[PDB]
Amino acid sequence: NSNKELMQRRSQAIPRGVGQIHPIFADRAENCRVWDVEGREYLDFAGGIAVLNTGHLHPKVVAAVEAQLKKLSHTCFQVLAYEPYLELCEIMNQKVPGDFAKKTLLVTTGSEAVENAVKIARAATKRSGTIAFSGAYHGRTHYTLALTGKVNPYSAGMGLMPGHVYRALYPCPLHGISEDDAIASIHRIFKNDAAPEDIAAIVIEPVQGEGGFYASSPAFMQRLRALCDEHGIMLIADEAQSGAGRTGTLFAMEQMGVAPDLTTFAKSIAGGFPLAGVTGRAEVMDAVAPGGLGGTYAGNPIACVAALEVLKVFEQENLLQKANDLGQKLKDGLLAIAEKHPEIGDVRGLGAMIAIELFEDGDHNKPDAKLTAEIVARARDKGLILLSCGPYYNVLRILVPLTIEDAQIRQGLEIISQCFDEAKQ
Amino acid sequence: NSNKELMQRRSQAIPRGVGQIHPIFADRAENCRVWDVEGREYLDFAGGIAVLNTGHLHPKVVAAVEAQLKKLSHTCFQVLAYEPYLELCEIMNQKVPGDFAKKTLLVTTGSEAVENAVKIARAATKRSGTIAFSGAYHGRTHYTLALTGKVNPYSAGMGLMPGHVYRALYPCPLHGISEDDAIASIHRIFKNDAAPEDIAAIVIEPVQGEGGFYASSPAFMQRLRALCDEHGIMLIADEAQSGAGRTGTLFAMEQMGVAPDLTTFAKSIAGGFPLAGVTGRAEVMDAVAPGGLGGTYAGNPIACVAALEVLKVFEQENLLQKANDLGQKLKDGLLAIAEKHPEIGDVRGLGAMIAIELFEDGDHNKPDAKLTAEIVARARDKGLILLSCGPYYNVLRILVPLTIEDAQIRQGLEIISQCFDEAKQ
Amino acid sequence: NSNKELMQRRSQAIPRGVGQIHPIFADRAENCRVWDVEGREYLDFAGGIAVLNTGHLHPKVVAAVEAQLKKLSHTCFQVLAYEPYLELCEIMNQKVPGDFAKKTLLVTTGSEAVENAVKIARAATKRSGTIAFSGAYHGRTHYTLALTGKVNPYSAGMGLMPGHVYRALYPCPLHGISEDDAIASIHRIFKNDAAPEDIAAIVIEPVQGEGGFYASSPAFMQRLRALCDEHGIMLIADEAQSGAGRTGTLFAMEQMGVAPDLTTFAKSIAGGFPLAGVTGRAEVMDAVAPGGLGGTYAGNPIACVAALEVLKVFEQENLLQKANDLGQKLKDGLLAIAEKHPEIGDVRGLGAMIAIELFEDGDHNKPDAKLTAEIVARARDKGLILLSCGPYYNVLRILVPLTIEDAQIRQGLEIISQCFDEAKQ
Amino acid sequence: NSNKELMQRRSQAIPRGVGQIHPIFADRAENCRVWDVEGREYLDFAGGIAVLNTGHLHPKVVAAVEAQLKKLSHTCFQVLAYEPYLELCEIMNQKVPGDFAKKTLLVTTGSEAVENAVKIARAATKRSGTIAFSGAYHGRTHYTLALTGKVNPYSAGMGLMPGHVYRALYPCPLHGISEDDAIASIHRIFKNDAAPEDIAAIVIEPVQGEGGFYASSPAFMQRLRALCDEHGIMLIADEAQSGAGRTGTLFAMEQMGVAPDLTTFAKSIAGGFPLAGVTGRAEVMDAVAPGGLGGTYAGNPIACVAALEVLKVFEQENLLQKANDLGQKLKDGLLAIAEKHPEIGDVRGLGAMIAIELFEDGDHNKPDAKLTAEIVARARDKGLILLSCGPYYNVLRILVPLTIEDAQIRQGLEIISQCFDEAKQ
Ligand SMILES: Cc1ncc(COP(=O)(O)O)c(CN)c1O
Ligand SMILES: Cc1ncc(COP(=O)(O)O)c(CN)c1O
Ligand SMILES: Cc1ncc(COP(=O)(O)O)c(CN)c1O
Ligand SMILES: Cc1ncc(COP(=O)(O)O)c(CN)c1O
């Protein structure tokens, strides 16, 4: 019942392959607070990696889950259906952007969601290839590791992942890749490796998560939409991390001015319970033949009621607006800290999907991974849990529950400021 | 509040890709009883497809879940660890067959488990190919669909799944495939398509589930073990369906007289909550570098305490001995019915993983898919939930909770018996 | 000069990868005779591996070549056409089996022939997968090595060859593979790994060459044709080695009672000059868009007139009939030797595609690669060039020119006869 | 005996997939002269696509061919070796750039050469992936089509080519790709799709042929060599078209200041006879196990003595020097014509590997293909045979034999000048 003892036991029973960002064993939690086995208290700015937008154990969510535990926990929908699954699908068909008839499939993880969205796109187009972007992250199954634009550590040592996945450039002006280069990198694929007629879908994160919290602009997204229409390519928006309200709208695509053919959701959608899904143009969704979709746990009853309560909470507690206000308050505080620390070369984010990127002496081509990691460690020592991300591990992101208290906003910003001041000593 | 009303809403909100064995919407359940939204009661012989060996909402399991629901439901282990995960791993390391040290990785679904088992074998052997068997089922992600020995419906319209997966024959004398043919088929692969030094693993189900409840014999499994040993090939045992006590021992491999290098488990391990995992040789498990294993929901807290409680229940309530007793009563009962119906050409099963196979006029070359389907439908009319399986859809399997009461064992057999008699005239 | 001296320079300037069956350097050859640099004379029963059906430098062929040599040796057909290429295609379109219009593509090597045949079937059916047989040999390019049913040493050390090539069993009663087993193995692929809708072609050798001179039966070929017809799959007959008269008919398929959709030809077609090609159902051949088929040396001028002359020589000199006569004399001579050597467990062959298989003590389960190799080495010391084959290197094949005189036939057989007697002493 | 009639015959016997640049049937030729079946004469500025650097039927080469034709034309080296093959390998071990021991493999086509070079690199490094450049061209086999950086028409309609071939950007300032962009595009592959440890080789054309006659600079080639050295990746130089003295030196790599690990050669190596090969670092060439390399026609006797004679002709006639002077006279004349026609936006080339690129209104962003095509057709009408190329087909290239006469260089330039003036009237 000590963090160190538990870490020792871990090294004996669990593979080192499962990294451990923080050597801490959480015991209990509530909203933005977490207590370890030693009773220490921490402020959670990671949110279980964008999974806790309604916070740890939201009362409404927990009450719903407890009620469902009195009825049943599993039947396997495809064997014996149940209402929570159907209801969520109906609601997602409406909530997901796209002014047309849609259908929803529930699965269990973000990885499976992307897996099924691609299987569906292939069935609908009768094509086999897919295009993803540099720095993308879509999961850890063989195929999603291929879609993921990061070999190390996700696929390191395992040999080459499935082929017929082509790499396009994600637009990122901060690093010299115009939206023109991005659109041009897709045409390069068409001309050099896979003609449009062999590409079932173009998979993209409206805002890259693990990739650095880089957001696609509406104009770029609009150009991509047009490129897919022109070629009959399904546009797949992976919103496992950008969805569930993190950006100010339930789904980031709503702010792009265009609708994808398929959308995946997970993480925060159920506020702490295993659930994910795929919503898309009905005709596309129906392309797969009966019996070709499913999974044992898919749309687990408890997770479904949890998701339904999360949606009601976003409405009841005005969480979308709070995401926006929270984001502005965070960037303002971050911009202040930056006026005193050159290493911070960028402060960005839609809604509450906030991040800052660190460069050596503000040199926009000198990723400061060491400083980034130093801040994470300092924040832990001050009781703050943070996550870094980005292909160069020089991006600090904030994923604190949207239900955060005013005081905790000040507390996190303060601690962060202290970290940059104590590191510069 | 009407099964048919709900089915209608289902067809407008959910893709046809998701099949529906029984057009019934469950509302609540307890042990082996399920009640639909109309209040009609059914006896559950499908168990959410082998996920409810401890029955629906086993009270010990639910109380554990309730206690944990008071502490936390999610942190993402890689970010902040927690005891239920660590603790289940230790238990699994001890329980899965193998006299060597093992390490366990917790994920969320059976597909993920197979996916990770293979990634681990690839990293450990530094090889890329894998071998699976005919009629096998390992999941619905691109790669596991490739391992799965069945294209339709799981892959129709989609195109070809990931390559570098070679097919071997599962031993099945009942249908002409001898143990010698099985083994010969692996050497044929070594000789024709992929040398031993390019095969990371041979994935096999000790007892094929979707494949028809065909069990491997200890003798075959031993030849297979020796063959893997000789080539440094990892033997992966997929015990998602055969595991968690279904066959009379916690894992089917315990009755094979040999131990695999890796074992994947799921479904019944958590008795109704989303969880799966991989347990294998520690040094093999540790071949993946830190950061190469993970997943957002992996080893969800709630599901972890559920699995821990399930294992305690197997001990306290003697479920393994009950499995063996249940299987004998079922097989005795089914053999009785077979005396009056020649169509029943085989009654088989280890422990409680019981199945009967139907043939037109007892002709072992004429699988009766029509009769099989009819029995399933007649049973539903009598209040019994059944599932069929096998590549020819002529196998009826029984996956009723091991916690079933004696009277319910008779009720089910009697119903099954009436279904056959009534299928005659 | 010295054979050994040349072998030494060889080991210094050429990689060990290029094996050397006979450590002999040829200087001159004519018809069935070869003289090495040491002036020693050899009777050639290998024919450059089935490339010299009209013998070394057939005078008619040489005269045609010399005449063309005065005109031009290369222009690259795609840039400037030339009659020899056009004229050969026209003749092949009519002589290749198939009661329908055909078109012919000329390439340079048997490997390229197969490569293009598969590319054309893929473009015509719009499918990507192919099926090949156990023990098959189709070339040494990445893709043809995948089709080739033998990994060592062709693919050894290189890793896995291209995917989406599935393995069926070649019918071979001698070793336990019945025609039913072979056809069942194709359905197995359809059910387990690749649906018919995803298979562009089934590649087969009417008579396997490197595989062991195992011939397909008309009945089997007919079942395969019906199976292909039923699923829209192209039947590709690789006749690089069985073609050009070796079996008694210009192409082996003529003796099968059915026509393939595509046929690849090579080796003896040009009697000792670099040339290969693909003749097939015209609309299939035309499925590829202009600019899609090509190659620099494709249908080389000198090699085309040689091929046109080889065809005339076959008519004028009655070689098809002679192949049958030659084959009968060889099989009789070999069966007489077999009456004294039990190790000879089989004497088989269509036309002059003759082979004998050696077994230890005469046990079909004990391939005698050692005796086989001894016969080859002894025969060479006696002035007879032989080649072995088969997956277990226990097959002696006879590929001697069809233009051989009766005396060389008696002579070659005596030499072979003595080798067996001296090997037992 | 009419071009039109032969073309009509062609449409009925040969597939449309084989495009016909010029609808002319050549009857005979000599050095740089070609006569069609109608007796019309042409000045060949295409050389059978860089295959006739020593011109059509060079008398010395023809005499060597004739002498060998009296000895033998084929035995299949790996069966019965022969001196011509051994001697050419010895010479290429010296001639190919690289101050260190080398070994040589002889195959038959430029495609097989690239196929074997990769096979060799994979065995040497024990890795499966490869990297090629945009606009590259390496052959028409499945695998070389994957390496080739152009889908249509080379591999269009056929589906997706073999995976595990990744795309980098070829340096090309003219179109905005800096050397840094090229090098960085390689790092992008290492981070996003295939770690260095999985890349067996990087394949590059010192000067892209079909790609538009774009040459790599010494500086870039040096960075590419350092990058390879650091990761253990084999650098494969494909000199099928750039080699055989086209650039002023025998091989273009000689002018790069660095040596590749493997080099492929073909086309002009044998002045118009089928031959190709791979020369590389001995230890690397030897990585393949014995028997792993081969080919029926490989290093054909007649093509070998032709290649040997071609190398002698280069030394005797000083063709390397003439290449440089030819290139200069060509550039000067083209720069002249360029002054009156702004459409000619670039005049480039190493040695005699000369090309000009056309732009609509000199606007480098508007690749003028229609004008390029017009020039080719006008030139044909004026008796000059030309070829275009480049990803946008706006590149005119000159591959006229190096043995061309001074008076014909003027004649050729005059015809081109007239074409531009007239196309602009
Ligand atoms: C955009 C995105 N897509 C997919 C996934 C995979 O989801 P899971 O971990 O639930 O399998 C993640 C997880 N961080 C993600 O951020
Ligand atoms: C042997 C086996 N392996 C893997 C799976 C896949 O598990 P999941 O559906 O939880 O993804 C199943 C599911 N019926 C199975 O029976
Ligand atoms: C049936 C078959 N197919 C293809 C090939 C390959 O031909 P090549 O060596 O000319 O590339 C051979 C050569 N022995 C063959 O026998
Ligand atoms: C650089 C290059 N590599 C490979 C090849 C393929 O050679 P082949 O046409 O002889 O098969 C070519 C032919 N245009 C080429 O230019």
mmCIF file with all atom_site columns, N, CA and C in Angstrom, chain D residues 306-342:
data_model
loop_
_atom_site.group_PDB
_atom_site.id
_atom_site.type_symbol
_atom_site.label_atom_id
_atom_site.label_alt_id
_atom_site.label_comp_id
_atom_site.label_asym_id
_atom_site.label_entity_id
_atom_site.label_seq_id
_atom_site.pdbx_PDB_ins_code
_atom_site.Cartn_x
_atom_site.Cartn_y
_atom_site.Cartn_z
_atom_site.occupancy
_atom_site.B_iso_or_equiv
_atom_site.pdbx_formal_charge
_atom_site.auth_seq_id
_atom_site.auth_comp_id
_atom_site.auth_asym_id
_atom_site.auth_atom_id
_atom_site.pdbx_PDB_model_num
ATOM 1   N N  . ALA D 1 306 ? 28.312 -9.774 -76.584 1.00 0.00 ? 306 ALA D N  1
ATOM 2   C CA . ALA D 1 306 ? 27.918 -8.483 -77.140 1.00 0.00 ? 306 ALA D CA 1
ATOM 3   C C  . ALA D 1 306 ? 28.302 -7.398 -76.117 1.00 0.00 ? 306 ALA D C  1
ATOM 4   N N  . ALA D 1 307 ? 27.967 -7.626 -74.848 1.00 0.00 ? 307 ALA D N  1
ATOM 5   C CA . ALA D 1 307 ? 28.303 -6.677 -73.776 1.00 0.00 ? 307 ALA D CA 1
ATOM 6   C C  . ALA D 1 307 ? 29.835 -6.515 -73.673 1.00 0.00 ? 307 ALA D C  1
ATOM 7   N N  . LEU D 1 308 ? 30.561 -7.626 -73.695 1.00 0.00 ? 308 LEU D N  1
ATOM 8   C CA . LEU D 1 308 ? 32.009 -7.564 -73.639 1.00 0.00 ? 308 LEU D CA 1
ATOM 9   C C  . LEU D 1 308 ? 32.564 -6.700 -74.785 1.00 0.00 ? 308 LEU D C  1
ATOM 10  N N  . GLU D 1 309 ? 32.023 -6.875 -75.991 1.00 0.00 ? 309 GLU D N  1
ATOM 11  C CA . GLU D 1 309 ? 32.457 -6.099 -77.154 1.00 0.00 ? 309 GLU D CA 1
ATOM 12  C C  . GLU D 1 309 ? 32.052 -4.622 -77.031 1.00 0.00 ? 309 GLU D C  1
ATOM 13  N N  . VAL D 1 310 ? 30.891 -4.360 -76.429 1.00 0.00 ? 310 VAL D N  1
ATOM 14  C CA . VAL D 1 310 ? 30.429 -2.988 -76.237 1.00 0.00 ? 310 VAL D CA 1
ATOM 15  C C  . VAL D 1 310 ? 31.420 -2.236 -75.325 1.00 0.00 ? 310 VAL D C  1
ATOM 16  N N  . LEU D 1 311 ? 31.888 -2.893 -74.267 1.00 0.00 ? 311 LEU D N  1
ATOM 17  C CA . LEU D 1 311 ? 32.837 -2.261 -73.363 1.00 0.00 ? 311 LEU D CA 1
ATOM 18  C C  . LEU D 1 311 ? 34.154 -1.982 -74.104 1.00 0.00 ? 311 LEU D C  1
ATOM 19  N N  . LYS D 1 312 ? 34.553 -2.880 -75.003 1.00 0.00 ? 312 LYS D N  1
ATOM 20  C CA . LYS D 1 312 ? 35.776 -2.666 -75.770 1.00 0.00 ? 312 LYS D CA 1
ATOM 21  C C  . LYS D 1 312 ? 35.591 -1.469 -76.687 1.00 0.00 ? 312 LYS D C  1
ATOM 22  N N  . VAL D 1 313 ? 34.423 -1.382 -77.324 1.00 0.00 ? 313 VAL D N  1
ATOM 23  C CA . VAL D 1 313 ? 34.134 -0.283 -78.228 1.00 0.00 ? 313 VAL D CA 1
ATOM 24  C C  . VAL D 1 313 ? 34.194 1.060  -77.493 1.00 0.00 ? 313 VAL D C  1
ATOM 25  N N  . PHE D 1 314 ? 33.737 1.098  -76.243 1.00 0.00 ? 314 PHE D N  1
ATOM 26  C CA . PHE D 1 314 ? 33.772 2.345  -75.480 1.00 0.00 ? 314 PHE D CA 1
ATOM 27  C C  . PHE D 1 314 ? 35.201 2.815  -75.261 1.00 0.00 ? 314 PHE D C  1
ATOM 28  N N  . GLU D 1 315 ? 36.107 1.860  -75.072 1.00 0.00 ? 315 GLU D N  1
ATOM 29  C CA . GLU D 1 315 ? 37.512 2.174  -74.849 1.00 0.00 ? 315 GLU D CA 1
ATOM 30  C C  . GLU D 1 315 ? 38.189 2.554  -76.169 1.00 0.00 ? 315 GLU D C  1
ATOM 31  N N  . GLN D 1 316 ? 37.978 1.756  -77.213 1.00 0.00 ? 316 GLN D N  1
ATOM 32  C CA . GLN D 1 316 ? 38.583 2.015  -78.516 1.00 0.00 ? 316 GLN D CA 1
ATOM 33  C C  . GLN D 1 316 ? 38.083 3.272  -79.197 1.00 0.00 ? 316 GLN D C  1
ATOM 34  N N  . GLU D 1 317 ? 36.767 3.456  -79.231 1.00 0.00 ? 317 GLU D N  1
ATOM 35  C CA . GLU D 1 317 ? 36.188 4.616  -79.901 1.00 0.00 ? 317 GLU D CA 1
ATOM 36  C C  . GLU D 1 317 ? 36.026 5.839  -79.027 1.00 0.00 ? 317 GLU D C  1
ATOM 37  N N  . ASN D 1 318 ? 36.464 5.733  -77.783 1.00 0.00 ? 318 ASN D N  1
ATOM 38  C CA . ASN D 1 318 ? 36.400 6.874  -76.886 1.00 0.00 ? 318 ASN D CA 1
ATOM 39  C C  . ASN D 1 318 ? 34.974 7.424  -76.723 1.00 0.00 ? 318 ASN D C  1
ATOM 40  N N  . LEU D 1 319 ? 33.990 6.530  -76.667 1.00 0.00 ? 319 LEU D N  1
ATOM 41  C CA . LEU D 1 319 ? 32.590 6.935  -76.547 1.00 0.00 ? 319 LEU D CA 1
ATOM 42  C C  . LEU D 1 319 ? 32.208 7.762  -75.322 1.00 0.00 ? 319 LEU D C  1
ATOM 43  N N  . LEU D 1 320 ? 32.949 7.621  -74.225 1.00 0.00 ? 320 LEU D N  1
ATOM 44  C CA . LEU D 1 320 ? 32.626 8.406  -73.040 1.00 0.00 ? 320 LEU D CA 1
ATOM 45  C C  . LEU D 1 320 ? 32.851 9.876  -73.346 1.00 0.00 ? 320 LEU D C  1
ATOM 46  N N  . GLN D 1 321 ? 33.990 10.175 -73.964 1.00 0.00 ? 321 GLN D N  1
ATOM 47  C CA . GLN D 1 321 ? 34.318 11.550 -74.307 1.00 0.00 ? 321 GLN D CA 1
ATOM 48  C C  . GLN D 1 321 ? 33.313 12.108 -75.327 1.00 0.00 ? 321 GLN D C  1
ATOM 49  N N  . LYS D 1 322 ? 32.988 11.317 -76.351 1.00 0.00 ? 322 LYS D N  1
ATOM 50  C CA . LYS D 1 322 ? 32.017 11.730 -77.365 1.00 0.00 ? 322 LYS D CA 1
ATOM 51  C C  . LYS D 1 322 ? 30.667 12.007 -76.718 1.00 0.00 ? 322 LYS D C  1
ATOM 52  N N  . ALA D 1 323 ? 30.360 11.263 -75.656 1.00 0.00 ? 323 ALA D N  1
ATOM 53  C CA . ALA D 1 323 ? 29.094 11.449 -74.952 1.00 0.00 ? 323 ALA D CA 1
ATOM 54  C C  . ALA D 1 323 ? 29.039 12.875 -74.435 1.00 0.00 ? 323 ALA D C  1
ATOM 55  N N  . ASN D 1 324 ? 30.108 13.310 -73.775 1.00 0.00 ? 324 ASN D N  1
ATOM 56  C CA . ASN D 1 324 ? 30.156 14.661 -73.245 1.00 0.00 ? 324 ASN D CA 1
ATOM 57  C C  . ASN D 1 324 ? 30.059 15.720 -74.337 1.00 0.00 ? 324 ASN D C  1
ATOM 58  N N  . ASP D 1 325 ? 30.760 15.512 -75.455 1.00 0.00 ? 325 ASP D N  1
ATOM 59  C CA . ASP D 1 325 ? 30.722 16.481 -76.556 1.00 0.00 ? 325 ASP D CA 1
ATOM 60  C C  . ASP D 1 325 ? 29.368 16.499 -77.251 1.00 0.00 ? 325 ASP D C  1
ATOM 61  N N  . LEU D 1 326 ? 28.770 15.324 -77.380 1.00 0.00 ? 326 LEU D N  1
ATOM 62  C CA . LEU D 1 326 ? 27.466 15.207 -78.000 1.00 0.00 ? 326 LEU D CA 1
ATOM 63  C C  . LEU D 1 326 ? 26.497 15.985 -77.139 1.00 0.00 ? 326 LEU D C  1
ATOM 64  N N  . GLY D 1 327 ? 26.563 15.735 -75.835 1.00 0.00 ? 327 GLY D N  1
ATOM 65  C CA . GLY D 1 327 ? 25.681 16.411 -74.905 1.00 0.00 ? 327 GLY D CA 1
ATOM 66  C C  . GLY D 1 327 ? 25.779 17.922 -74.989 1.00 0.00 ? 327 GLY D C  1
ATOM 67  N N  . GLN D 1 328 ? 26.999 18.420 -75.184 1.00 0.00 ? 328 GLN D N  1
ATOM 68  C CA . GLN D 1 328 ? 27.239 19.853 -75.265 1.00 0.00 ? 328 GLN D CA 1
ATOM 69  C C  . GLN D 1 328 ? 26.661 20.426 -76.555 1.00 0.00 ? 328 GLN D C  1
ATOM 70  N N  . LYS D 1 329 ? 26.949 19.769 -77.673 1.00 0.00 ? 329 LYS D N  1
ATOM 71  C CA . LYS D 1 329 ? 26.426 20.216 -78.953 1.00 0.00 ? 329 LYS D CA 1
ATOM 72  C C  . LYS D 1 329 ? 24.903 20.222 -78.901 1.00 0.00 ? 329 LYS D C  1
ATOM 73  N N  . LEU D 1 330 ? 24.325 19.210 -78.259 1.00 0.00 ? 330 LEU D N  1
ATOM 74  C CA . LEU D 1 330 ? 22.877 19.126 -78.142 1.00 0.00 ? 330 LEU D CA 1
ATOM 75  C C  . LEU D 1 330 ? 22.340 20.267 -77.295 1.00 0.00 ? 330 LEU D C  1
ATOM 76  N N  . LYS D 1 331 ? 22.914 20.465 -76.112 1.00 0.00 ? 331 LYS D N  1
ATOM 77  C CA . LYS D 1 331 ? 22.464 21.544 -75.239 1.00 0.00 ? 331 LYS D CA 1
ATOM 78  C C  . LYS D 1 331 ? 22.562 22.899 -75.928 1.00 0.00 ? 331 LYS D C  1
ATOM 79  N N  . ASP D 1 332 ? 23.697 23.165 -76.570 1.00 0.00 ? 332 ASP D N  1
ATOM 80  C CA . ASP D 1 332 ? 23.867 24.446 -77.242 1.00 0.00 ? 332 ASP D CA 1
ATOM 81  C C  . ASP D 1 332 ? 22.765 24.661 -78.256 1.00 0.00 ? 332 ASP D C  1
ATOM 82  N N  . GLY D 1 333 ? 22.536 23.670 -79.114 1.00 0.00 ? 333 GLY D N  1
ATOM 83  C CA . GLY D 1 333 ? 21.495 23.793 -80.122 1.00 0.00 ? 333 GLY D CA 1
ATOM 84  C C  . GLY D 1 333 ? 20.099 23.965 -79.536 1.00 0.00 ? 333 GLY D C  1
ATOM 85  N N  . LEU D 1 334 ? 19.857 23.328 -78.390 1.00 0.00 ? 334 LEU D N  1
ATOM 86  C CA . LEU D 1 334 ? 18.558 23.400 -77.729 1.00 0.00 ? 334 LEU D CA 1
ATOM 87  C C  . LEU D 1 334 ? 18.383 24.750 -77.041 1.00 0.00 ? 334 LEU D C  1
ATOM 88  N N  . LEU D 1 335 ? 19.455 25.277 -76.461 1.00 0.00 ? 335 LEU D N  1
ATOM 89  C CA . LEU D 1 335 ? 19.401 26.582 -75.814 1.00 0.00 ? 335 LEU D CA 1
ATOM 90  C C  . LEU D 1 335 ? 19.098 27.633 -76.878 1.00 0.00 ? 335 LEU D C  1
ATOM 91  N N  . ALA D 1 336 ? 19.671 27.437 -78.063 1.00 0.00 ? 336 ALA D N  1
ATOM 92  C CA . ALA D 1 336 ? 19.453 28.346 -79.184 1.00 0.00 ? 336 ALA D CA 1
ATOM 93  C C  . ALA D 1 336 ? 17.973 28.390 -79.535 1.00 0.00 ? 336 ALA D C  1
ATOM 94  N N  . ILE D 1 337 ? 17.405 27.222 -79.818 1.00 0.00 ? 337 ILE D N  1
ATOM 95  C CA . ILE D 1 337 ? 15.992 27.123 -80.162 1.00 0.00 ? 337 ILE D CA 1
ATOM 96  C C  . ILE D 1 337 ? 15.127 27.677 -79.027 1.00 0.00 ? 337 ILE D C  1
ATOM 97  N N  . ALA D 1 338 ? 15.605 27.517 -77.796 1.00 0.00 ? 338 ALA D N  1
ATOM 98  C CA . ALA D 1 338 ? 14.887 27.982 -76.615 1.00 0.00 ? 338 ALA D CA 1
ATOM 99  C C  . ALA D 1 338 ? 14.708 29.499 -76.588 1.00 0.00 ? 338 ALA D C  1
ATOM 100 N N  . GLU D 1 339 ? 15.649 30.216 -77.185 1.00 0.00 ? 339 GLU D N  1
ATOM 101 C CA . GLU D 1 339 ? 15.569 31.661 -77.207 1.00 0.00 ? 339 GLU D CA 1
ATOM 102 C C  . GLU D 1 339 ? 14.377 32.160 -78.014 1.00 0.00 ? 339 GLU D C  1
ATOM 103 N N  . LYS D 1 340 ? 14.014 31.437 -79.068 1.00 0.00 ? 340 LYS D N  1
ATOM 104 C CA . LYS D 1 340 ? 12.874 31.827 -79.893 1.00 0.00 ? 340 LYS D CA 1
ATOM 105 C C  . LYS D 1 340 ? 11.555 31.220 -79.387 1.00 0.00 ? 340 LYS D C  1
ATOM 106 N N  . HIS D 1 341 ? 11.654 30.244 -78.489 1.00 0.00 ? 341 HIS D N  1
ATOM 107 C CA . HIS D 1 341 ? 10.466 29.578 -77.957 1.00 0.00 ? 341 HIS D CA 1
ATOM 108 C C  . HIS D 1 341 ? 10.542 29.437 -76.439 1.00 0.00 ? 341 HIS D C  1
ATOM 109 N N  . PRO D 1 342 ? 9.881  30.348 -75.705 1.00 0.00 ? 342 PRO D N  1
ATOM 110 C CA . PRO D 1 342 ? 9.842  30.377 -74.235 1.00 0.00 ? 342 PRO D CA 1
ATOM 111 C C  . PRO D 1 342 ? 9.210  29.138 -73.609 1.00 0.00 ? 342 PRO D C  1
#
